Amino acid sequence: MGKLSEQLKHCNGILKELLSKKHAAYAWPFYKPVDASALGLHDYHDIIKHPMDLSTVKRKMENRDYRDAQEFAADVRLMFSNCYKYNPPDHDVVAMARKLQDVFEFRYAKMPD
């Protein structure tokens, strides 16, 4: 198995973990695209040029869209950055993002070489 395949299986494992019951208490705001209209965030799409969420990452992984781990990481980090850009840093969703990003970053660091 090639290194890109092996690294994308590590990425797929991380993605499975981020969507797992273990992290659900803080991962759930990142499961589906932000429904700005439903949440009354009528400025969301003016501020966030590139929306990203774990369902979109899962679809891109299933569709073999990601060519390497770096591409996968960039979407997961884009999702967190969107949260930090839109939200005051003392808001509950930001605490949830920080916790889920901690799970992501520590396991992404264990990438097989």
Ligand X SMILES: CCNC(=O)c1ccc(O[C@@H](C)c2ccccc2)c(-c2cn(C)nn2)c1
- What is the size of the binding site for ligand X (CB under 6 A)? 13
Give the H/E segment covering residue 94: helix 92-108
Tokens found for residue 98? 């920080």
Give residues with Cβ within 8 angstroms of 94, minimum separation 6. 83, 84, 87, 88
Pick the stretch among 12-20, 57-65, 69-77, 91-99 that binds ligand X (CB under 6 A): 91-99
CA atoms within 13 A on the CB side of 3: 4
Question: How many other CB atoms sit within 10 Å of the CB of residue 15?
Answer: 22
Q: Could you say whether residue 51 binds ligand X (CB under 6 A)?
A: no
What is the rounded distance in angstroms from the CA atom of residue 86 to the CA atom of residue 46? 10
Q: Could you say whether residue 95 binds ligand X (CB under 6 A)?
A: no
Instruction: Compute the least distance from the CB of residue 22 to ligand X, in Å.
Output: 18
Instruction: Compute the least distance from the CB of residue 13 to ligand X, in Å.
Output: 23
Q: Could you say whether residue 92 binds ligand X (CB under 6 A)?
A: yes
Q: Could you say whether residue 86 binds ligand X (CB under 6 A)?
A: yes
* Chain positions contacting ligand X, by CB under 6 A: 29-30, 34, 39, 41, 83, 86-88, 91-93, 96
